[PDB]
Symmetry: D2
Subunit: 234 residues, 4 copies
Amino acid sequence: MQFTGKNVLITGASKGIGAEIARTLASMGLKVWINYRSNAEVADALKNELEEKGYKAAVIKFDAASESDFVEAIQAIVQSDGGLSYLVNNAGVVRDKLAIKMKTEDFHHVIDNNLTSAFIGCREALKVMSKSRFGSVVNIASIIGERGNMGQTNYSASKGGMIAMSKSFAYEGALRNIRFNSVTPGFIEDYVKNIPLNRLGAAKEVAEAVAFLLSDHSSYITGETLKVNGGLYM
Amino acid sequence: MQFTGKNVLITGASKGIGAEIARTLASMGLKVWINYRSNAEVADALKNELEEKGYKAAVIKFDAASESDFVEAIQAIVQSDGGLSYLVNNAGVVRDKLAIKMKTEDFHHVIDNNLTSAFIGCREALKVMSKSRFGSVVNIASIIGERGNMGQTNYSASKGGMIAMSKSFAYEGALRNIRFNSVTPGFIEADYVKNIPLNRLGAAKEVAEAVAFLLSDHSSYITGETLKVNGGLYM
Amino acid sequence: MQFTGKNVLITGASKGIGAEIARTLASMGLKVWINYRSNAEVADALKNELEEKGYKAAVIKFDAASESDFVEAIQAIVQSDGGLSYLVNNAGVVRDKLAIKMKTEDFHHVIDNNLTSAFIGCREALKVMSKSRFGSVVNIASIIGERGNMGQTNYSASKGGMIAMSKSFAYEGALRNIRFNSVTPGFIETADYVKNIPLNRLGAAKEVAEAVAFLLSDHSSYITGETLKVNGGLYM
Amino acid sequence: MQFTGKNVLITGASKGIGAEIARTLASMGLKVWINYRSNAEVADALKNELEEKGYKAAVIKFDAASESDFVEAIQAIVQSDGGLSYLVNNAGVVRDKLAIKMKTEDFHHVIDNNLTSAFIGCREALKVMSKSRFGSVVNIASIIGERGNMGQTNYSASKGGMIAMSKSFAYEGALRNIRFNSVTPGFIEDYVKNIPLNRLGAAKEVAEAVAFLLSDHSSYITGETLKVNGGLYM
Ligand SMILES: NC(=O)c1ccc[n+]([C@@H]2O[C@H](COP(=O)([O-])OP(=O)(O)OC[C@H]3O[C@@H](n4cnc5c(N)ncnc54)[C@H](OP(=O)(O)O)[C@@H]3O)[C@@H](O)[C@H]2O)c1
Ligand SMILES: NC(=O)c1ccc[n+]([C@@H]2O[C@H](COP(=O)([O-])OP(=O)(O)OC[C@H]3O[C@@H](n4cnc5c(N)ncnc54)[C@H](OP(=O)(O)O)[C@@H]3O)[C@@H](O)[C@H]2O)c1
Ligand SMILES: NC(=O)c1ccc[n+]([C@@H]2O[C@H](COP(=O)([O-])OP(=O)(O)OC[C@H]3O[C@@H](n4cnc5c(N)ncnc54)[C@H](OP(=O)(O)O)[C@@H]3O)[C@@H](O)[C@H]2O)c1
Ligand SMILES: NC(=O)c1ccc[n+]([C@@H]2O[C@H](COP(=O)([O-])OP(=O)(O)OC[C@H]3O[C@@H](n4cnc5c(N)ncnc54)[C@H](OP(=O)(O)O)[C@@H]3O)[C@@H](O)[C@H]2O)c1
């Protein structure tokens, strides 16, 4: 795919879907910044892999649920590269229980760490992308955020709020060509029963949806939610 | 409308949409419980207005965002009336501001107040209504939670999260006939009215009647739905 | 429920969900006009049952897919009645098959009969309700129109078209206080399927009928262009 | 973007959005079949321009609303190329008028011509793509099929029916790996006012959204309605 931008920051990218987004975007020629919070071994391993395939990769440590930490990280990337073309808000956790077994503590943890991180990222994207009249931001949402689930009142709250907040951000960034969109993965690798495509999704399929929404090919799409769930939910 | 249930708790019912919801359900024979946080001047005045007109009304206290406070009023109401049929999560604030001028303080205040509160309400509705195999909960969301708005990242996050959480709760309470539903009002009382097909602002009372429908027996097969009351502003 | 308006025409009302809308609206004091197409007997039995129960009811024969018949029937009701306050486009057919087995014949029949009929209904409603600045029209759609279904390309086409056309009609009727809304029933009783319904049961026809009543009644005076899901959680 | 398949038919592709879709899919390596009904001038001009630019391109004459005539066209393509990997139902007309002024003739014309044609395309796609267990179909709908518009009861009916029928076809084709998806463009080159991106859309951005949905990058996406409207509707 074709990118006018040059670099991308991916929160929570040391493993899983975030790692695969990093891998996909770096194989398409963007310099990927791979966020991690705790142990650096796995992030450093991914960065080494990506350079060793010939790509551009750097690692950066911050807590995406911390305002100061994540503002200073974006400032450091601006100072190293000259700007920031792309952001992927992927940082997220799960703490599933039935609601009657869930303290407001278990709710606040998931809400803060899944929504406020995305809010910080989107606001800082608005700041650093405005001067150049160019940017794209993708919020990794979920199918749970669109339909809800048993035992996932907190998670579904966070990712439905992410879907609606992202549209608000699209409204605010659209006049300076700063686009915001959500991706709602389905089941990514019994549950396979209800999937019409009769298989789990690969992380790469998510990653290439993200790549499309960051790319120039989606330059008229903003404020949209892209389902990547094999037909589980239309 | 027809109600098998007997009483309702309405958070933030002292004025505006909450109070006129309260008037509405009282007029249809339900015992209303106005909930307030600060002054009891308007809440008491409402309560009295509702009892002169011949209706059953009382008041109760908590910060609907406070877990303990919320819970403990719900036991108080169960002990007074023998149960709680209906709940309306109406409590909510706005703190509008462009996102770049918005401290995460201003974001947490709105999230914690507007959606954690609805979480305590819904989770406790599940608890008190499960025994009796009957219940109906309506969460008062907004068109902003469906479409988003400039200057309302915090409010749209809270209300959209409510709308989705409501669906999860509907899942958890469906097997026991506890129904969960949301209402998304539009602009409720000139350039604003240009984009409303009905060409007018909504009365707080139209929102209240939609809430009554979702609480009544007439919606007994409707759970997990989001009912748009916006005069056509959003379809 | 409260109704400012006085009478209602329900298309396809001689049996099933339409008969239950007629029964429910009759019991709320509306004069119901029960439409039928072919054999009257079942329709006149419904009219007699409603009149015995103390309610107002009449029958009227016309083909909802025929522009002239449906025009002329609405004109007749306006002249018996003084006007027409409420309309329920309930007429619909199914011809389920897989698409590779479906002729275009089998597609137009369901389209011409499920959508065009609603189009005529809503357009005549606009006409006859404009002067009095009051009116409410409900279009009986389906969950299939929202979600799509195997073997139901034609039916889902017709009901999704109905759902979107109903919103356009809301736009055109909104200035004369003529509201347009849709109901999307799920699986209604007439047990593999009850699996995927959270409420763990089929719906009753009366639950649909009461949702229709709400969308006709005064209580929904600010709700227009909406699609009200009656499916017990099968689709959110 | 990559494509496992080799060719694509596009109905109503002689000018406008369909021409741009032909132009875009041609530059990415697909052999494009340019459908037209009436004059062949403009379609030959398109063909000659794409063959000038080094690409494979062929015109084909048929009325998309006629069952026999678009079944036969698909059959002739199958015989020439050996198969058909991709289809784009783009044929479409408007006859805008207030509902009280609109004969059922006016309604039937737009219905028969916008929605029946897509039905004939999607069934025939089911038939010809099933054996190879590979295919992708994109139905070009509209924002009007999602929110409605005054004066456009007929167009909105056709396009919203297209959007729901496409999910039904997605269900039917899922097991064979034949994907169905819709595109809902907004305003495509006062009005601009209500568009957050503050400009009309290029046919070119619609065409690239279509390309993504046909491509291998959307291989876990079926039954989706991808909005291309610059924030005009979220
Ligand atoms: N897999 C699915 O089916 C599915 C579908 C829907 C969406 N997604 C989304 O996919 C994303 C991650 O994919 P995954 O399921 O493969 O999860 P995963 O394997 O847990 O990867 C999540 C990553 O995000 C990190 N993270 C969490 N909070 C963070 C913070 N505040 N700052 C920085 N990094 C943070 C992780 O925590 P640690 O430091 O603890 O490793 C981890 O590296 C999330 O947004 C999830 O909500 C998942
Ligand atoms: N009006 C609209 O256009 C619109 C549309 C969408 C939905 N709604 C919803 O309508 C509801 C209220 O209607 P309104 O707009 O008319 O607002 P309002 O006039 O401000 O009434 C809101 C009430 O909720 C109370 N409240 C706030 N937080 C509370 C808490 N934690 N515990 C208990 N009570 C609390 C208020 O606070 P005080 O103690 O500070 O008075 C006040 O009595 C909200 O949920 C809002 O989100 C508004
Ligand atoms: N049952 C469900 O699960 C379900 C769910 C979604 C919505 N609905 C909708 O419910 C409505 C009817 O309910 P039902 O399922 O109980 O169907 P039903 O039992 O078949 O009742 C349908 C009625 O509509 C009549 N009708 C058909 N075309 C007509 C026309 N052109 N003019 C006048 N009447 C016409 C019937 O035809 P005859 O003269 O041939 O009897 C019959 O009386 C339809 O709109 C259907 O599309 C059904
Ligand atoms: N432009 C927009 O703002 C917008 C937005 C939403 C979607 N779209 C969709 O985009 C498509 C067309 O793009 P456009 O707006 O640029 O329209 P256009 O300029 O009119 O191009 C439409 C083409 O489709 C052809 N066509 C119509 N019916 C046909 C049939 N039965 N068989 C074969 N070809 C047929 C045309 O007819 P002739 O032979 O009469 O030339 C013409 O070549 C349609 O599906 C329209 O509904 C338009």
